[PDB]
UniProtKB/Swiss-Prot annotation, chain A:
Location of the protein in the cell: Cytoplasm, Cytosol; Golgi apparatus membrane; Cytoplasmic vesicle, COPI-coated vesicle membrane
Parent-protein start and end of this portion: 260 to 388 of 905
Record-given protein name: Coatomer subunit beta'
Residues spanning the membrane: none
Task performed by this protein: The coatomer is a cytosolic protein complex that binds to dilysine motifs and reversibly associates with Golgi non-clathrin-coated vesicles, which further mediate biosynthetic protein transport from the ER, via the Golgi up to the trans Golgi network. Coatomer complex is required for budding from Golgi membranes, and is essential for the retrograde Golgi-to-ER transport of dilysine-tagged proteins.
Quaternary structure and partners: Oligomeric complex that consists of at least the alpha, beta, beta', gamma, delta, epsilon and zeta subunits. Probably interacts with PEX11A. Interacts with SCYL1. Interacts with JAGN1.
WD repeat segments: 91-129
Swiss-Prot record, chain B:
Subunit architecture: Oligomeric complex that consists of at least the alpha, beta, beta', gamma, delta, epsilon and zeta subunits.
Keywords associated with the record: Acetylation, Cytoplasm, Cytoplasmic vesicle, ER-Golgi transport, Golgi apparatus, Membrane, Phosphoprotein, Protein transport, Transport
Family: Belongs to the adaptor complexes medium subunit family. Delta-COP subfamily.
GO cellular component: COPI vesicle coat; COPI-coated vesicle; endoplasmic reticulum; Golgi apparatus; Golgi membrane
An example Gene Ontology biological process: cerebellar Purkinje cell layer maturation
Places the protein is found: Cytoplasm; Golgi apparatus membrane; Cytoplasmic vesicle, COPI-coated vesicle membrane
Function: The coatomer is a cytosolic protein complex that binds to dilysine motifs and reversibly associates with Golgi non-clathrin-coated vesicles, which further mediate biosynthetic protein transport from the ER, via the Golgi up to the trans Golgi network. Coatomer complex is required for budding from Golgi membranes, and is essential for the retrograde Golgi-to-ER transport of dilysine-tagged proteins.
Source organism per UniProt: Mus musculus (Mouse)
Main location per the UniProt record: cytoplasm
Name of protein: Coatomer subunit delta
From Swiss-Prot, chain C:
Domain of life: Eukaryota
Tissue: Predominantly expressed in the upper one-third of the oxyntic mucosa and in most regions of the pyloric mucosa. Ubiquitously expressed including platelet, liver, heart, spleen, lung and kidney.
Compartments reported by the entry: Cytoplasm; Golgi apparatus membrane; Cytoplasmic vesicle, COPI-coated vesicle membrane; Cell membrane
Ranges of the HEAT repeats in the UniProt entry: 13-49, 50-87, 89-121
Part of the intact protein present: 228 to 348 of 953
Subunit record text: Oligomeric complex that consists of at least the alpha, beta, beta', gamma, delta, epsilon and zeta subunits. Interacts with CAPN8. Interacts with SCYL1 and PRKCE. Interacts with COPG1. Interacts with ARF1 (myristoylated); this interaction is required for binding of COPB1 to Golgi membranes. Interacts (via trunk domain) with ARF1 (via switch I region); the interaction is direct. Interacts with KCNK2 (via N-terminus); this interaction increases the channel-mediated whole cell currents and promotes plasma membrane expression of KCNK2. Interacts with STX17. Interacts with TMEM115.
Gene: Copb1
Leftover remarks: Brefeldin A induces dissociation from the Golgi of the beta-COP and presumably the other coatomer subunits.
Protein name as annotated: Coatomer subunit beta
Function: The coatomer is a cytosolic protein complex that binds to dilysine motifs and reversibly associates with Golgi non-clathrin-coated vesicles, which further mediate biosynthetic protein transport from the ER, via the Golgi up to the trans Golgi network. Coatomer complex is required for budding from Golgi membranes, and is essential for the retrograde Golgi-to-ER transport of dilysine-tagged proteins.
């Protein structure tokens, strides 16, 4: 939407170049008075596993970022990574800064922008705010 | 002494300038430096390499070797650290290493060697400290 | 004057003595898992494949101490990286597969690696 | 619009105008090419400066690592791209990349190629292996 995420100055000024790491989350920027290597955020995912087998994440595959979904009912061998095993989950209204299922499975919480919205475990109707 | 000599070498097959703290390694200094630093101190691009039962620590600069030699040792960090401080002091005198310019500032380098390592025990030096002496 | 009662108290000097002092207080079946020895040790074979090959050897040794028959030579400690639970995720054996080699890494590392597959299992 | 960010200053270094900044293709080091005639690289995880190379005495606009050869390519106002070994510290090769100073270099790890872009309005290709 090209809306300003941040403006950064440093007391180095005149920023000539940019480049980005191809494996991602470091960008480095060349200035008149020096160079800086900078580290960008998001290093880790937000998700939670309840007891209903709705393990909910945001982003990823068979889930959108804006909406909320995910399920994981698979128990295949401990030695490898298990499939996504997602089942579809209803409405959301906010972005997931952190998105989490209830630890015993009755609530879902999506948190975002100074607000939390509560959606119901497997029905996803707005429970609470 | 723990540190036999502190030596700047050219791998022309001779010790270009060198320091004998107390009279021991005179002529001896040149033969060691001349043979061993030619082979990269017999190194493989490793700072510590030991040959003919003498520990050689080094750094290549051009056709020249800045060399520290010991045949005994008190600590790991220390041997490198005197060499390192030496490597701050040497381009102030000679603008990198190079046999003719090393040759011309025998006095400068030699004096630093006495100051840096005294009776084989690694003292410390710095480019400002060096100034008071050659003033 | 060396040997401290402490962990340290600070600075490279104290730190260098300290790994010597640690090897004393646990000599038993090599260091196993190398202490502060690891830092100098890489430079000791800067030419270049020989470090990995060596590193691979230690990592294999460390996994387990097996029976130690003909080319089953893994020393160090018996349990410290186990071998072979069926609930362990994503398992020990993944690292063990590297050691089985056709050349899968380069030849110096290869010769070390084939012996090392034989050695753990 | 919201996004998971957290800007952090991993390492800084002060030097005369750095035209190019790079991350090492496979290593945790970042190389910055400066107008000191020097290119300098620092590994901004352990905060150790791994090595410096004096490409020219006039600005080095570009620098990049050709990680496989264990070499770094630089292009400076010598109108040359000079190549050095970043562990055996010596100049691997010297060549005239262009008729003018070299603003940027791009490295193809899968091919022997670097193409360099210069302000002689031309981009030229060089093959490190030849």
């Amino acid at each position: 939407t090209y809306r300003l995420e941040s403006t950064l100055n440093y007391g180095m000024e005149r920023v000539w170049c940019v480049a980005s790491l191809r494996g991602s989350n470091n960008v480095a920027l060349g200035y008149d008075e020096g160079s800086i290597i900078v580290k960008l955020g998001r290093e880790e995912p937000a998700m939670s596993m309840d007891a209903n087998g709705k393990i909910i994440w945001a982003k990823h595959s068979e889930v959108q970022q804006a909406n909320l979904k995910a399920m994981g009912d698979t128990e295949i061998k401990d030695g490898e990574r298990l499939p996504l095993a997602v089942k579809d989950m209803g409405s959301c209204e906010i972005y997931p800064q952190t998105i989490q299922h209830n630890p015993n499975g009755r609530f879902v919480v999506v948190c975002g922008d100074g607000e939390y919205i509560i959606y119901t475990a497997m029905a996803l109707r707005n429970k609470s705010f | 002494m723990v540190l036999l000599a502190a030596a700047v070498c050219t791998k022309a097959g001779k010790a270009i300038v060198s320091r004998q703290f107390v009279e021991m390694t005179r002529t001896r200094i040149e033969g060691l430096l001349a043979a061993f630093p030619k082979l990269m101190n017999t190194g493989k691009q490793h700072t510590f390499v030991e040959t003919e039962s003498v520990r050689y620590v080094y750094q290549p600069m051009e056709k020249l070797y800045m060399v520290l030699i010991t045949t005994k040792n008190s600590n790991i960090l220390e041997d490198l650290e005197t060499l390192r401080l030496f490597s701050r002091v040497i381009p102030e005198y000679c603008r990198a290493l190079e046999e003719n310019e090393i040759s011309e500032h025998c006095f400068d380098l030699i004096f630093a060697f006495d100051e840096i390592v005294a009776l084989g025990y690694r003292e410390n030096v710095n480019l400002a400290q060096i100034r008071t002496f050659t003033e | 004057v060396e040997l401290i009662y402490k962990v340290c108290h600070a600075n490279p000097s104290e730190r260098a003595r300290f790994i010597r002092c640690i090897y004393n207080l646990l000599q038993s079946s090599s260091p196993a898992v190398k202490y502060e020895a690891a830092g100098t040790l890489v430079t000791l074979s800067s030419a270049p494949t020989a470090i990995k090959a060596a590193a691979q050897c230690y990592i294999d040794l460390i996994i387990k101490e097996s029976d130690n028959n003909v080319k089953l030579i893994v020393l160090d400690r018996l349990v410290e990286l186990k071998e072979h639970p069926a609930h362990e995720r994503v398992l020990q054996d993944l690292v063990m597969d590297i050691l089985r080699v056709l050349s899968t890494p380069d030849l110096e590392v290869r010769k070390k690696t084939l012996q090392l597959a034989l050695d753990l299992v | 619009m919201p996004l998971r960010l957290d800007i952090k200053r991993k390492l800084t270094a002060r030097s005369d105008r750095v035209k190019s900044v790079d991350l090492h293709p496979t290593e945790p080091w970042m190389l910055a090419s400066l107008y000191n005639g020097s290119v300098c690289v620092w590994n901004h995880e352990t905060q150790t400066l791994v090595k410096t190379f004096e490409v020219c005495d006039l600005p080095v606009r570009a620098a990049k690592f050709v990680a496989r050869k264990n070499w770094v390519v630089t292009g400076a106002d010598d109108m040359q791209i000079r190549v050095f070994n970043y562990n055996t510290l010596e100049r691997v090769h010297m060549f005239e990349a262009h008729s003018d100073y070299i603003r940027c270099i791009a490295v193809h790890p899968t091919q022997p190629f670097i193409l360099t872009s210069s302000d002689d309005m031309l981009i030229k290709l060089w093959d490190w292996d030849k």
